[PDB]
Design a protein around this ligand. Structure first.
Ligand SMILES: NCCSC[C@H]1O[C@@H](n2cnc3c(N)ncnc32)[C@H](O)[C@@H]1O
Length: 393
DNA sequence: GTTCGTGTC
DNA sequence: GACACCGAAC
């Protein structure tokens, strides 16, 4: 619920409004962005803050305060400038997710937002809402998690931004103390088109932006930090996804409902493996991390691919490629499981060595930095491997 | 069928 | 700060 002063200062340096313009801080609490903007650019604007919690709303006389759910709020008139730090979190059951609303409210959210996809996130909804509240040519400056650059849940959001105007993304990374989030600033303007990607560096003003790459024809594709070397490697090889079907492991409740699964070791039973069992180039078949055991030979009932040795790639070891050949064909409750496409003939050991290579680790760290704590399917399917006869590049 | 985000030390 | 969710969500 806080933004560091130098993140505020950076964002205000990116903000613009015509004089007499309408300036809005959604989820405002005491209105730090309104205050910072007014300090920097003076008093000749109309300042509005929207806050859902009356005990949090605390603005000076010069700002209009509104007590409402920003996501359901409909002003009479659109805005010249919208800035701030929206709330984040998945709306769902408290046992698993942090954002708790009545089902009727979540239904209203899904109705209001065309970018709502999968579990989605409050911050996605705040972005779509803000764009919708902009006058043509209006500017939005938000600080949000980096996850929307790459994740499937945000594909509709990226496509929406791409067609609604022009987007600049500035990577900050993990700049909130005591908060484990890699953050970006988004500067969007409701006009023109394209994407500009910027790095940043800490400075006495706060952050200095460094232009990284421009994508004038951006249509909502995943956003990555490309370099000469990442580009060269990709074109030198072919995508891993063109050689393999990529599946995910059966999930924990699938195992818990299977008649042969037990919560205890026993004769003829094998541990159900998790990501903690997967190592670079080998599998630990000994230690049980799942709390579940089953007859090895019945695993194929959950997914057919459990029946034979195959390549397993890690999902939750950060931005890394950690791969092994599961020669025993054990049951897995986690990770990616890669099955060769028709007529593909490879050497498991060669491919494993390549995927685990220092070169491959550097490749993914460059493109995807710390946006998310996973190697995702979208990243995995693009990993460059040797070109194979029958599908070159 | 598979996605996504603090918890631990 | 490295290494992990795991199951409610669609
Ligand atoms: N802008 C700082 C971080 S977001 C935290 C703040 O947003 C508020 N908030 C959470 N959800 C909101 C919503 N849907 N509409 C308006 N304010 C909201 C909280 O009350 C809190 O003050």
């Amino acid at each position: 619920v806080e933004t560091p002063p130098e993140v505020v200062d950076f964002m205000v340096s990116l903000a613009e409004a015509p004089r007499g313009g309408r300036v809005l801080e959604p989820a405002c609490a005491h209105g730090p962005f309104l205050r910072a903007f007014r300090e920097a650019h003076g008093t000749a604007y109309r300042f509005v803050g929207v806050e859902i919690d009356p005990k949090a709303l605390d603005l000076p006389p010069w700002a209009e305060g509104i007590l409402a759910d920003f996501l359901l709020w409909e002003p009479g008139e659109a805005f010249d400038l919208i800035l701030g730090n929206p709330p984040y979190g998945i709306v769902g059951e408290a046992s698993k997710y942090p954002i708790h609303v009545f089902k009727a409210v979540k239904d209203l959210y899904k109705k209001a937002f065309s970018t709502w996809k999968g579990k989605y996130n409050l911050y996605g909804a705040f972005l779509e809402k803000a764009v919708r509240l902009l006058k043509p040519g209006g500017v939005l400056v938000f600080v949000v998690p980096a996850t929307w650059l790459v994740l499937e849940d945000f594909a509709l959001l990226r496509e929406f931004l791409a067609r609604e105007g022009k987007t600049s993304v500035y990577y900050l990374g993990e700049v909130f103390p005591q908060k484990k989030v890699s953050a970006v600033v988004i500067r969007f303007q409701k006009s023109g088109k394209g994407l500009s990607l910027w790095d940043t560096q800490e400075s006495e003003s706060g952050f200095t932006p460094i232009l990284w790459a421009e994508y004038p024809h951006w249509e909502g594709e995943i956003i990555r930090f490309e370099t000469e070397e990442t580009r060269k490697l990709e074109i030198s090889g072919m995508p891993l996804g063109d050689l393999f079907h990529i599946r995910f492991a059966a999930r924990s409740p699938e195992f818990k409902k299977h008649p042969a699964v037990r919560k205890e070791p026993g004769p003829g039973l094998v541990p159900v493996l998790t990501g903690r069992n997967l190592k670079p180039g080998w599998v630990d078949y000994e230690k049980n991390h799942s709390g579940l055991w089953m007859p090895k030979e019945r695993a194929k009932e959950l997914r057919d691919f459990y029946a034979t040795p195959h390549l397993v790639v890690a999902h939750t070891k950060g931005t890394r490629v950690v791969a092994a050949w599961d020669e025993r064909a054990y049951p897995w409750r986690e990770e990616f499981h890669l099955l060769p496409k028709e007529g593909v003939r490879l050497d498991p050991s060669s491919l494993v060595q390549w995927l685990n290579s220092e070169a491959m680790q550097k490749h993914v760290r460059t493109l995807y930095r710390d946006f998310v704590p996973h190697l995702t399917l979208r990243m995995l399917e693009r990993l460059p491997v040797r070109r194979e006869y029958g599908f070159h590049t």
